[PDB]
Design a protein around this motif. Sequence first.
Motif, PDB file in Angstrom:
ATOM      1  N   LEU A 164      -2.095 -56.817  84.904  1.00 46.37           N
ATOM      2  CA  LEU A 164      -0.804 -56.760  85.041  1.00 46.37           C
ATOM      3  C   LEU A 164       0.056 -56.520  83.340  1.00 46.37           C
ATOM      4  O   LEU A 164       0.874 -55.673  83.526  1.00 46.37           O
ATOM      5  CB  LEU A 164      -0.152 -58.278  85.193  1.00 46.37           C
ATOM      6  CG  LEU A 164      -0.467 -58.513  86.756  1.00 46.37           C
ATOM      7  CD1 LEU A 164      -0.370 -59.986  86.363  1.00 46.37           C
ATOM      8  CD2 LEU A 164       0.119 -57.940  87.462  1.00 46.37           C
ATOM      9  N   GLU A 165      -0.751 -57.326  82.606  1.00 50.49           N
ATOM     10  CA  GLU A 165       0.143 -56.041  81.277  1.00 50.49           C
ATOM     11  C   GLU A 165      -0.892 -55.546  80.756  1.00 50.49           C
ATOM     12  O   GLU A 165       0.313 -54.516  80.230  1.00 50.49           O
ATOM     13  CB  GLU A 165      -0.899 -57.290  80.218  1.00 50.49           C
ATOM     14  CG  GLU A 165      -0.364 -59.282  79.486  1.00 50.49           C
ATOM     15  CD  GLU A 165      -1.239 -60.086  81.071  1.00 50.49           C
ATOM     16  OE1 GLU A 165      -2.593 -59.385  81.796  1.00 50.49           O
ATOM     17  OE2 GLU A 165      -0.713 -61.244  81.090  1.00 50.49           O
ATOM     18  N   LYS A 166      -1.509 -54.933  81.581  1.00 50.13           N
ATOM     19  CA  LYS A 166      -1.768 -53.362  81.191  1.00 50.13           C
ATOM     20  C   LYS A 166      -2.994 -52.777  82.019  1.00 50.13           C
ATOM     21  O   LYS A 166      -3.527 -52.141  82.144  1.00 50.13           O
ATOM     22  CB  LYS A 166      -2.980 -53.124  79.098  1.00 50.13           C
ATOM     23  CG  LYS A 166      -4.024 -53.631  79.152  1.00 50.13           C
ATOM     24  CD  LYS A 166      -4.232 -53.861  78.216  1.00 50.13           C
ATOM     25  CE  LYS A 166      -3.475 -54.272  78.000  1.00 50.13           C
ATOM     26  NZ  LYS A 166      -3.896 -53.999  75.624  1.00 50.13           N
ATOM     27  N   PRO A 167      -1.799 -52.033  82.941  1.00 45.24           N
ATOM     28  CA  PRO A 167      -2.233 -51.233  83.774  1.00 45.24           C
ATOM     29  C   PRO A 167      -3.255 -49.783  83.864  1.00 45.24           C
ATOM     30  O   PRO A 167      -3.922 -49.602  84.157  1.00 45.24           O
ATOM     31  CB  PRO A 167      -1.043 -50.793  85.080  1.00 45.24           C
ATOM     32  CG  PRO A 167      -0.244 -50.723  83.330  1.00 45.24           C
ATOM     33  CD  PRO A 167      -0.192 -51.596  82.751  1.00 45.24           C
ATOM     34  N   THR A 168      -2.775 -48.493  82.887  1.00 43.57           N
ATOM     35  CA  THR A 168      -3.509 -48.360  82.027  1.00 43.57           C
ATOM     36  C   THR A 168      -4.227 -48.142  81.451  1.00 43.57           C
ATOM     37  O   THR A 168      -5.298 -47.797  80.323  1.00 43.57           O
ATOM     38  CB  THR A 168      -2.782 -47.003  81.765  1.00 43.57           C
ATOM     39  OG1 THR A 168      -1.816 -47.494  80.604  1.00 43.57           O
ATOM     40  CG2 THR A 168      -1.925 -46.704  83.098  1.00 43.57           C
ATOM     41  N   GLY A 169      -4.823 -49.638  80.589  1.00 47.64           N
ATOM     42  CA  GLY A 169      -6.030 -49.555  80.259  1.00 47.64           C
ATOM     43  C   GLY A 169      -5.312 -49.382  78.505  1.00 47.64           C
ATOM     44  O   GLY A 169      -6.443 -48.847  77.535  1.00 47.64           O
ATOM     45  N   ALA A 170      -4.501 -49.134  77.922  1.00 49.26           N
ATOM     46  CA  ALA A 170      -4.253 -48.975  76.603  1.00 49.26           C
ATOM     47  C   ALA A 170      -4.330 -50.229  75.547  1.00 49.26           C
ATOM     48  O   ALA A 170      -4.451 -51.324  75.803  1.00 49.26           O
ATOM     49  CB  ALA A 170      -1.877 -48.758  75.735  1.00 49.26           C
ATOM     50  N   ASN A 171      -4.799 -49.535  74.532  1.00 55.78           N
ATOM     51  CA  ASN A 171      -5.311 -50.319  73.816  1.00 55.78           C
ATOM     52  C   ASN A 171      -6.520 -51.547  73.699  1.00 55.78           C
ATOM     53  O   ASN A 171      -6.489 -52.795  73.300  1.00 55.78           O
ATOM     54  CB  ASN A 171      -4.102 -52.049  72.743  1.00 55.78           C
ATOM     55  CG  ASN A 171      -3.174 -51.020  72.649  1.00 55.78           C
ATOM     56  OD1 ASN A 171      -2.375 -51.219  72.843  1.00 55.78           O
ATOM     57  ND2 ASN A 171      -2.760 -49.526  71.770  1.00 55.78           N
ATOM     58  N   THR A 172      -7.388 -51.112  75.266  1.00 52.08           N
ATOM     59  CA  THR A 172      -8.536 -51.549  74.888  1.00 52.08           C
ATOM     60  C   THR A 172     -10.059 -50.338  74.670  1.00 52.08           C
ATOM     61  O   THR A 172     -10.370 -49.332  74.515  1.00 52.08           O
ATOM     62  CB  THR A 172      -8.829 -51.194  76.737  1.00 52.08           C
ATOM     63  OG1 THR A 172      -8.781 -49.877  77.303  1.00 52.08           O
ATOM     64  CG2 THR A 172      -7.047 -52.043  77.656  1.00 52.08           C
ATOM     65  N   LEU A 173     -10.968 -52.278  74.410  1.00 57.64           N
ATOM     66  CA  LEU A 173     -12.143 -51.528  74.194  1.00 57.64           C
ATOM     67  C   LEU A 173     -13.165 -51.742  75.015  1.00 57.64           C
ATOM     68  O   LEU A 173     -13.489 -53.712  75.380  1.00 57.64           O
ATOM     69  CB  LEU A 173     -12.642 -52.349  72.523  1.00 57.64           C
ATOM     70  CG  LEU A 173     -13.784 -52.032  71.990  1.00 57.64           C
ATOM     71  CD1 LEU A 173     -14.016 -50.697  71.324  1.00 57.64           C
ATOM     72  CD2 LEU A 173     -13.576 -52.983  71.188  1.00 57.64           C
ATOM     73  N   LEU A 174     -13.930 -50.473  75.879  1.00 54.72           N
ATOM     74  CA  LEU A 174     -14.339 -51.444  76.679  1.00 54.72           C
ATOM     75  C   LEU A 174     -16.014 -51.489  76.896  1.00 54.72           C
ATOM     76  O   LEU A 174     -16.604 -50.027  75.941  1.00 54.72           O
ATOM     77  CB  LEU A 174     -14.290 -50.234  77.863  1.00 54.72           C
ATOM     78  CG  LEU A 174     -14.785 -50.080  78.807  1.00 54.72           C
ATOM     79  CD1 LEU A 174     -14.128 -51.491  80.447  1.00 54.72           C
ATOM     80  CD2 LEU A 174     -15.506 -48.780  79.777  1.00 54.72           C
ATOM     81  N   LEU A 175     -16.297 -52.723  76.829  1.00 55.88           N
ATOM     82  CA  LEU A 175     -18.095 -53.173  76.441  1.00 55.88           C
ATOM     83  C   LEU A 175     -18.763 -52.932  77.783  1.00 55.88           C
ATOM     84  O   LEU A 175     -18.445 -53.701  78.767  1.00 55.88           O
ATOM     85  CB  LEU A 175     -17.884 -53.738  75.503  1.00 55.88           C
ATOM     86  CG  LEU A 175     -17.913 -53.804  74.141  1.00 55.88           C
ATOM     87  CD1 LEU A 175     -16.554 -53.438  73.392  1.00 55.88           C
ATOM     88  CD2 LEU A 175     -18.406 -55.697  73.249  1.00 55.88           C
ATOM     89  N   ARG A 176     -20.247 -53.136  77.444  1.00 58.54           N
ATOM     90  CA  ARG A 176     -21.007 -53.155  78.316  1.00 58.54           C
ATOM     91  C   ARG A 176     -22.528 -53.898  78.134  1.00 58.54           C
ATOM     92  O   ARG A 176     -22.692 -53.593  76.717  1.00 58.54           O
ATOM     93  CB  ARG A 176     -21.635 -52.070  79.251  1.00 58.54           C
ATOM     94  CG  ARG A 176     -21.980 -51.034  79.066  1.00 58.54           C
ATOM     95  CD  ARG A 176     -22.786 -50.072  79.728  1.00 58.54           C
ATOM     96  NE  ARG A 176     -22.216 -49.017  80.596  1.00 58.54           N
ATOM     97  CZ  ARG A 176     -21.503 -47.877  80.800  1.00 58.54           C
ATOM     98  NH1 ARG A 176     -21.669 -47.029  79.104  1.00 58.54           N
ATOM     99  NH2 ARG A 176     -21.460 -47.336  81.485  1.00 58.54           N
ATOM    100  N   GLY A 177     -22.633 -54.847  78.422  1.00 58.72           N
ATOM    101  CA  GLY A 177     -24.139 -55.835  77.534  1.00 58.72           C
ATOM    102  C   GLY A 177     -25.276 -54.697  77.698  1.00 58.72           C
ATOM    103  O   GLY A 177     -25.502 -53.471  78.663  1.00 58.72           O
ATOM    104  N   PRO A 178     -26.175 -55.001  76.728  1.00 56.69           N
ATOM    105  CA  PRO A 178     -27.096 -54.077  76.513  1.00 56.69           C
ATOM    106  C   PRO A 178     -28.219 -53.951  77.758  1.00 56.69           C
ATOM    107  O   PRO A 178     -29.077 -55.432  78.263  1.00 56.69           O
ATOM    108  CB  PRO A 178     -28.009 -55.686  75.245  1.00 56.69           C
ATOM    109  CG  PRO A 178     -27.708 -56.779  76.539  1.00 56.69           C
ATOM    110  CD  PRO A 178     -26.030 -56.174  76.704  1.00 56.69           C
ATOM    111  N   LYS A 179     -28.435 -52.946  79.061  1.00 55.58           N
ATOM    112  CA  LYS A 179     -29.597 -52.463  79.675  1.00 55.58           C
ATOM    113  C   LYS A 179     -30.982 -52.747  79.139  1.00 55.58           C
ATOM    114  O   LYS A 179     -31.478 -53.063  80.317  1.00 55.58           O
ATOM    115  CB  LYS A 179     -28.891 -51.561  80.235  1.00 55.58           C
ATOM    116  CG  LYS A 179     -29.129 -51.049  81.427  1.00 55.58           C
ATOM    117  CD  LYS A 179     -28.419 -49.795  81.983  1.00 55.58           C
ATOM    118  CE  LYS A 179     -28.795 -49.154  83.517  1.00 55.58           C
ATOM    119  NZ  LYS A 179     -28.300 -50.798  84.436  1.00 55.58           N
TER     120      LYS A 179
END
Lengths: 129, 149, 66
Positions: free
Chosen positions: A113-128
């Motif tokens: 809702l706030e950011k449909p295209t992911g602006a100002n987003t830092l995307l993380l995943r955990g330690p595999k």
Amino acid sequence: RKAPKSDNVYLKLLVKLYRFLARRTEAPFNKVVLRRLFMSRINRPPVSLSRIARNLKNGNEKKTVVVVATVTDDNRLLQVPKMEVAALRFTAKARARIEAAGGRTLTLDQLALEKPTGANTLLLRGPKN
Amino acid sequence: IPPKPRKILQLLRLRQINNGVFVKVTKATAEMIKIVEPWVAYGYPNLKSVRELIYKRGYGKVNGQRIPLTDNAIIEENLGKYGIICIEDLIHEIFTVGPNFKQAANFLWPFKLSNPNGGFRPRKFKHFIEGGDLGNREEHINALIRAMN
Amino acid sequence: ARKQRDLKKFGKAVQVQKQLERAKQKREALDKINQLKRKRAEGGALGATEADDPFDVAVDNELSRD
RNA sequence: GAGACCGAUAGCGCACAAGUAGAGUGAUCGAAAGAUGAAAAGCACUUUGAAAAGAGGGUUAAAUAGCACGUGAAAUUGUUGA
RNA sequence: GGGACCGAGGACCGCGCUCUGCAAGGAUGCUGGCGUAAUGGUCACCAGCGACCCGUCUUGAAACACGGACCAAGGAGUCAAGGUUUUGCGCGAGUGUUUGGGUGUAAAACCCGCACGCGUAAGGUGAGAGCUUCGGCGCAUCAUCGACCGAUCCUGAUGUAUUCGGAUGGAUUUGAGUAGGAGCGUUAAGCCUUGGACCCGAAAGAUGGUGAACUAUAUGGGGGCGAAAGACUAACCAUCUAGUAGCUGGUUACCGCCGAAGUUUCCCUCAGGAUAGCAGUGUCGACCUUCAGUUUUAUGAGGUAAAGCGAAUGAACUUUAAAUAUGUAAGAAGCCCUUGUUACUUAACUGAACGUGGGCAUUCGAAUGUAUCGACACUAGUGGGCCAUUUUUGGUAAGCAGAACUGGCGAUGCGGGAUGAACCGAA
RNA sequence: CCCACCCAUACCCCGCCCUCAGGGUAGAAACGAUGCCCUGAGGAGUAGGCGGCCGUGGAGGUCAGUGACGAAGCCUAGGGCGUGAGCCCGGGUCGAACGGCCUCUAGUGCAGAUCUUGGUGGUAGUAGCA
């Protein structure tokens, strides 16, 4: 994958929402999010408050850290900074610590809702490993 | 079939009986066709052969799909960046071997021909120069294409 | 056990090689007899009986004498 | 007192005059076999037949339920039809 | 001009043309008989063509052998414990109520104390998914250089109880290391071990009982040692026992998709293991990125045939060079050239390695194909050969034997060769 | 040596089934979205792997399900559906219970096992009944 493995009805709602977003938007962020909801739990390792804090230590403040995983509290981090955190689910302690620090909790539908295209987003995943 | 002729057939896209492909003459491919001498029949087509092969059995590879060449429009989207914008341009580029013959021939799906009307010859599995059908029939492949269309 | 495993794995090739080697030995035996008769036909120089030494050292000695 | 058990080739060997009938010198071994019908109302009487039984008649909602009995498959058999 | 088979779709859109319209993104118009067994379908028979009886077992394959009188019912991978992989779920640095206690509508359900089980108490270079205010930021993870710790070999500081310690700098070292936790509980499926262990079936041994059988006379019973006197060491019944096999036989609906191997290497002499290969699943990085049983170019190994010797010299001669297969290489995953460092090296800023700058992003350095390729982890079935072409070694009177390549058979139906594992066509 | 002709599941055109691949489908006049529409390609198969379905006994929920005006079972030179395992209906018999749907559960599917039990065949009105 055409069908999600999980039987979570709300996860099915989320994968439908992000299917629509990935189809009708140019967003590699949306495509990656859809793939991460499709992939199974062992392939979505937890991300801790310590990991997100050390990743936002740089000029990435005032942003939305997004993880398709469960955010876990780290006892080793003494101070939790303000941060715009979006995840599938929070632990009670991580939720309380973020809310006491001054951040906000967002679910993935809110994040859409706030950011449909992911602006100002830092995307993380955990330690595999 | 030995593996060398098998690979040559795979690289010349001839993968079924009666699948014909346009090639430009050059020493490398001449040697390849000489290696597959005992399995193919090759020759020099004329304007009529090129025209009717494109018009009747012409299918293009559009995004990996066999789409009949029913529209100058689709010819234009697939080969517009090479200047080929119509079936006449494709026929010109194939017959008069032009700069972009490789792209035109690759776009053209291998022409799936039928069995010839009138038979091959009483013994079709020997060389054309000893009264068979295999080998290099120079200008007689036009007659073979007439029979096979 | 190691040696017997090697023998079991290479048994037949040994038989084939032995057969070829014996045929080969037959071949040089006949060849040596051939140069023997060629030399005796060309010329030669013997005694009453013939050398009592074995027919091998004898033929080498005579084809060395020439 | 109960059961996400079994349901007469199952469930204990035994749902029945079953550790019975029977076998072995003996120690021992050890079965098969439940169901008419709501109620016997379990077919009076006549005729044929030495009898067994059959044909009429009768009880019954039903005898296409007759104590060779709920329902009544297959293998196998008889008659008739093609 | 004549004939045959077909009519898929269901408002318009589009390409068009010969544009009052049309053969232009799939058949409409007109008419007839019948409107019921007429069409159609099912049984029995006839006709034309086709057509070995199933399963098991062995083998490269047949052949053989085994089981099959018929029908009904029963009939064979299950349960428990301990491991392990993946999937779903809950909580998450924690997790698990159910030993037990407290309620209860009473073997249910709900609640909980203390313990207890398992786990927990720092970079750079180049990348990189993704954001970007297009200035750059950069998860996971990787290659290298890093930093530190447990351990090993040293180097040896103030000092100290005069015999106590490891600090600095190090090392072609090692960790199932740290490097900002992932586990616990449970559901489903799979695999391993043990129990009867998918089902049926070997001779034996033991414990406890019941009986008889011997021209041997109530009784004597086997063996060897010793002079003796003497010391030593069968049958049926029930149970342990559902004993032990690798061996035999058997192992229960359908459809769809994907689909093999028959082999390399190593260990060990077994009723074989491990690695690789074929097949599949999951994860990670790319985009025809890149690859390829293939041609071309350049260069090797065969100068093998041939022409000449009015070129020299004489298969072993050559200007040239056949046929025939065959190894390597073909770009940014690049070459150089230029000078900064180094503990290497040199008479030397001299060479080599590590770097900087440049050069081509457009034909980036042959063709042709490309129904994607690479890395990691996990899982099932496979370890036989037979025939033939070509090349090649040996031999016989002739047979034939042995290697290498490729091709057919396995797991493959169809047309032809009258017939038929090895033939021809074609999957 | 020349001409014409015959046909394989092979090759070409079209129809249909399935699978795979590539696209579209929300300020909803909107959909068994596990759906629908468009396009292309492919289709043998042992060991083995994966998926979807059919059937049996019992359990929870539901169909305010069926039923002595006839449940279940059985028989049928009577029909309909599905590629198929199977499913549904008609006629006759019969008498007392049974079924569909979503989950759960298992002593759940037979042609073999010189299978077990039971019943019955040909041999055969034969050998034979001293």
